[PDB]
Amino acid sequence: GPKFPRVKNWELGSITYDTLCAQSQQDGPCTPRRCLGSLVLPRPAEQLLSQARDFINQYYSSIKRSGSQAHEERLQEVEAEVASTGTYHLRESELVFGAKQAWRNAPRCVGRIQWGKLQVFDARDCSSAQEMFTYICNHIKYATNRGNLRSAITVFPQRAPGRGDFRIWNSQLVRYAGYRQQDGSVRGDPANVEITELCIQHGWTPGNGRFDVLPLLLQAPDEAPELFVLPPELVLEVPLEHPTLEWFAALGLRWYALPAVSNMLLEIGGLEFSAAPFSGWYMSTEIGTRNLCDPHRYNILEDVAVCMDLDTRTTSSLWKDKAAVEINLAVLHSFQLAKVTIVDHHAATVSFMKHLDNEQKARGGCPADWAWIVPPISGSLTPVFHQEMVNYILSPAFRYQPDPW
Amino acid sequence: KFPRVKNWELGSITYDTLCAQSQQDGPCTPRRCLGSLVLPRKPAEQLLSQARDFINQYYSSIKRSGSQAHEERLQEVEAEVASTGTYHLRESELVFGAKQAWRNAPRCVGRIQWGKLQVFDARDCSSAQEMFTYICNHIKYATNRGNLRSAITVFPQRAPGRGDFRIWNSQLVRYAGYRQQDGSVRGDPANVEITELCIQHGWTPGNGRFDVLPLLLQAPDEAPELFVLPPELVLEVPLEHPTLEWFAALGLRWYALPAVSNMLLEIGGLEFSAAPFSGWYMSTEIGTRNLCDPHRYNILEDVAVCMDLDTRTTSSLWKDKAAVEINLAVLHSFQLAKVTIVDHHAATVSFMKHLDNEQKARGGCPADWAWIVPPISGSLTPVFHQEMVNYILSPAFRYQPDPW
Numbered sequence A: 001g002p003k004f005p006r007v008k009n010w011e012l013g014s015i016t017y018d019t020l021c022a023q024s025q026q027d028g029p030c031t032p033r034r035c036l037g038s039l040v041l042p043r044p045a046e047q048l049l050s051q052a053r054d055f056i057n058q059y060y061s062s063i064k065r066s067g068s069q070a071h072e073e074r075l076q077e078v079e080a081e082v083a084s085t086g087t088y089h090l091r092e093s094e095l096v097f098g099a100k101q102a103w104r105n106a107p108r109c110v111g112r113i114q115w116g117k118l119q120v121f122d123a124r125d126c127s128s129a130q131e132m133f134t135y136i137c138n139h140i141k142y143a144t145n146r147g148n149l150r151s152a153i154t155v156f157p158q159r160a161p162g163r164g165d166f167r168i169w170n171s172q173l174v175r176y177a178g179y180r181q182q183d184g185s186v187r188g189d190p191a192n193v194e195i196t197e198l199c200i201q202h203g204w205t206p207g208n209g210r211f212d213v214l215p216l217l218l219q220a221p222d223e224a225p226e227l228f229v230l231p232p233e234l235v236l237e238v239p240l241e242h243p244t245l246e247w248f249a250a251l252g253l254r255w256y257a258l259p260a261v262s263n264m265l266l267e268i269g270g271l272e273f274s275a276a277p278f279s280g281w282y283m284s285t286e287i288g289t290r291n292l293c294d295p296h297r298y299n300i301l302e303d304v305a306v307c308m309d310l311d312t313r314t315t316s317s318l319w320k321d322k323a324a325v326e327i328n329l330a331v332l333h334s335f336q337l338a339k340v341t342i343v344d345h346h347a348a349t350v351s352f353m354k355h356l357d358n359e360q361k362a363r364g365g366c367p368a369d370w371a372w373i374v375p376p377i378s379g380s381l382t383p384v385f386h387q388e389m390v391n392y393i394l395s396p397a398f399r400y401q402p403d404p405w
Numbered sequence B: 001k002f003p004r005v006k007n008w009e010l011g012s013i014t015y016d017t018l019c020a021q022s023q024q025d026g027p028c029t030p031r032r033c034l035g036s037l038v039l040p041r042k043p044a045e046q047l048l049s050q051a052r053d054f055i056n057q058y059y060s061s062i063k064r065s066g067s068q069a070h071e072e073r074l075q076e077v078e079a080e081v082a083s084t085g086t087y088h089l090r091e092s093e094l095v096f097g098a099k100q101a102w103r104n105a106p107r108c109v110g111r112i113q114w115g116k117l118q119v120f121d122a123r124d125c126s127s128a129q130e131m132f133t134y135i136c137n138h139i140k141y142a143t144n145r146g147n148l149r150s151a152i153t154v155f156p157q158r159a160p161g162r163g164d165f166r167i168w169n170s171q172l173v174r175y176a177g178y179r180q181q182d183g184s185v186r187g188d189p190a191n192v193e194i195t196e197l198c199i200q201h202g203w204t205p206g207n208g209r210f211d212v213l214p215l216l217l218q219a220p221d222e223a224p225e226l227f228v229l230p231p232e233l234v235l236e237v238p239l240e241h242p243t244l245e246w247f248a249a250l251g252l253r254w255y256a257l258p259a260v261s262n263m264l265l266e267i268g269g270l271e272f273s274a275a276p277f278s279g280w281y282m283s284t285e286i287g288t289r290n291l292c293d294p295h296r297y298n299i300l301e302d303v304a305v306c307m308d309l310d311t312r313t314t315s316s317l318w319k320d321k322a323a324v325e326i327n328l329a330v331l332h333s334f335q336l337a338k339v340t341i342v343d344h345h346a347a348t349v350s351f352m353k354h355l356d357n358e359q360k361a362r363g364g365c366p367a368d369w370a371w372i373v374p375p376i377s378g379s380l381t382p383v384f385h386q387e388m389v390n391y392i393l394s395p396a397f398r399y400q401p402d403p404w
């Protein structure tokens, strides 16, 4: 009946319509002629003002004062600030709402049931790389909380016309080094070969382990990036063991507690925060399947399968599926043992389904990227697999940005 | 302009130029992507242009573009449409069209095989009885005592003003689903409705979990007729496990032949509303979707308890462990019974080879990532890390409404 995408759950037979997508102001990559929904990265005061107006309207709606005196005054205040300076600034409570809405709007994040509980740290007074380091350490301490992890984001000053950006060069606050070898192989995390070489070029004395924590490369405006080593006591790690396979511990595997993305751009009302690291807690498949089993990452599948004595000479033995399972179980078991927050892919997807129902009621839909929401193992075993999803771009948003080098 | 397609495991990049040949809109728009949706939301000049396009494809396929045989066939088609509002395919054109529709099917992981397809012309069918004979031959040919062979049987095309030839069943072989008094379902819950239709049309129902359904076949503007498949035609594989001796005691089994019977085959503007096709199973279809889906046979918990796994919590990964052993049982049992089957690793590996072949042959390949990526162990397969472009090429298989 209604002129909006009809969305179906095939497990439960239930139907919803997404009216929220009508609020989207920015185009995705798809056209009627072809769907590009599987691509990871698909390709002026007038413009700013309309984005600023839209966001201020969003903010005043959220506090139930849409159409009010203070609403129209804030609108006038922003237009006049853009009139004289070419940009404008957010009130603290506007920044908090916007950071939360950006998370809420993130189609690829399965953790969004938690969106209303996000600690927003204002670091818009930051004026140096040393000061960025302090704020980042504070974020890591607060968010790690000795294993009882808390969602947090730290927001550094916005892009300024003329002036250069605040940037964190690392893709995460915690990452393991990747050292290219003579034979052409990589020791450590192959994902991190480039940032590792950048750190060395900038004066880091490199290790030679599989799990060396990288230093931070931090760039304050119009300045070369400075190098900062995180003090080991701040970086909580978890040695990996298996509940029943006693040899698993002898593999010497481990992972860090805090998943903190540090290279994404936070956009709010046309303002761009080029440095705004955020952190949650892991879903176990991120570590157990992607980081540890991706062929282009640590690639430990064959190693674990040989220890399990599987027939790795034939696909039909399902040796890959078997090893992958035990590795995920190991990640789950070790984090629980160490009392570090983690969520398995079953409980995560169940909570996301609950989130979808909340947002259906609250907003008339929820933008979601099926390929990213569905876990990388046991897909159809989780409820989200059977849930159709509409994907679109809402603002405030987190967006990829080019590497600063 | 043209999509840039990256494989994130290998760092390799292709560009899809084939998508520019799409003449049919999918569900997406720049404002929102609807790629995860299973189904679509919903004259002479048009038909003639779809026809010329297809005849052009055919003659190009046999390296005779521009030949007088090409020119003459274009005029036959034009003369026939201009006089009758429609036209008919030559058998060779039909054979080519069916192979191309399979080739162009974005959701099929089995397309490496697309050039090897037995095509039965059943367009001289005038009754449900005759459809049944054709279907039985298809099943015999395709099953081949467990050495499965891909096949399609093509029944008469749609015609203006008259009803369609239709097979009412969604597959040639399906197990019955009997709604019990207490709201549960004995058998396959996916087939409750088709089971009820069969009973209403005179079928005497069984009461098992794996009762093979009769076929409801419909000749134009006639009530469907009921036909029981001779039990010797329907090859089945009892499921057992290589190391778990108790597994056979579950009484599980599945049929050898995966044959879709409710899709529409469109070629050159002509529509074939009954054109059942079959290949062979990819193991996860049976082991994961058919047996483990919560709204199907849903055996996960049962298997987990036999394995004495901790069912109380999600974090023991009991579901993941049980699912793996079930898929293993399927592979072992089909291999023991000498029935053709492909595991999801072998399948996805051959699909990558197909993507490469198609890049060289056509400059691209329409693929639906959500469907190509297996339902367990996704990122453990190469297709997970492969960007894909989805679009509709013709000849095509399409969904169509239920005839009831």
Ligand code: HEM
Binding pocket: A099, A103, A106, A108, A109, A110, A111, A112, A114, A118, A151, A152, A153, A278, A279, A280, A281, A282, A283, A286, A343, A348, A372, A398
């Ligand atoms: C609280 C627990 C959280 C969980 C369990 C969680 C889970 C996830 C997962 C599994 C992904 C997929 C990432 C990948 O596969 O590369 C993801 C992506 C993402 N998350 Fe979260 N997340 C959480 C918190 C947060 C927070 C606090 C934010 C921001 C305020 C956030 C924003 C995002 C964004 C923007 C992406 C997309 C990143 C990309 O496209 O590369 N998440 N999340």
Ligand code: HEM
Binding pocket: B098, B102, B105, B107, B108, B109, B110, B111, B113, B117, B150, B151, B152, B263, B277, B278, B279, B280, B281, B282, B285, B342, B347, B371, B397
């Ligand atoms: C020969 C071995 C074959 C294999 C291994 C194979 C594999 C698959 C699989 C796994 C699917 C997804 C089905 C689902 O999960 O619902 C699929 C879909 C499909 N296949 Fe095949 N297939 C084979 C042969 C064929 C043949 C012979 C045809 C037609 C001539 C064909 C046409 C299609 C079409 C049109 C779909 C989409 C079905 C839908 O949208 O419901 N396949 N295939």
Ligand SMILES: Clc1cccc(CCCNCCc2ccnc(-n3ccnc3)n2)c1
Binding pocket: A040, A041, A109, A111, A172, A259, A260, A261, A278, A279, A280, A281
């Ligand atoms: Cl090489 C490349 C190019 C484009 C996108 C890509 C995705 C990787 C980044 N995606 C986020 C991964 C990640 C890591 C730690 N933590 C989170 N995280 C934290 C809270 N929520 C998600 N997410 C890679």
Ligand SMILES: Clc1cccc(CCCNCCc2ccnc(-n3ccnc3)n2)c1
Binding pocket: B038, B039, B108, B110, B171, B258, B259, B260, B277, B278, B279, B280
């Ligand atoms: Cl319930 C619902 C409504 C609309 C579409 C849907 C798709 C399911 C069927 N998709 C094909 C399943 C299937 C079964 C047997 N065999 C094959 N098969 C054979 C060769 N290739 C695929 N495919 C379900």
Ligand SMILES: C[C@H](O)[C@H](O)[C@H]1CNc2nc(N)[nH]c(=O)c2N1
Binding pocket: A038, A039, A040, A371, A372, A373, B008, B384, B385, B386, B387, B388
């Ligand atoms: C090619 C494909 O889009 C790519 O491998 C995607 C698929 N889904 C994903 N899903 C999540 N959560 N994270 C990822 O990195 C990816 N990668």
Ligand SMILES: C[C@H](O)[C@H](O)[C@H]1CNc2nc(N)[nH]c(=O)c2N1
Binding pocket: A010, A385, A386, A387, A388, A389, B035, B036, B037, B038, B370, B371, B372
């Ligand atoms: C909603 C979602 O698109 C739907 O459940 C899809 C996902 N991928 C699939 N993939 C295959 N092979 N078969 C399916 O039925 C589905 N179902």
Ligand SMILES: [Zn+2]
Binding pocket: A030, A034, A035, A036, A037, B028, B032, B033, B034, B035
């Ligand atoms: Zn799309």
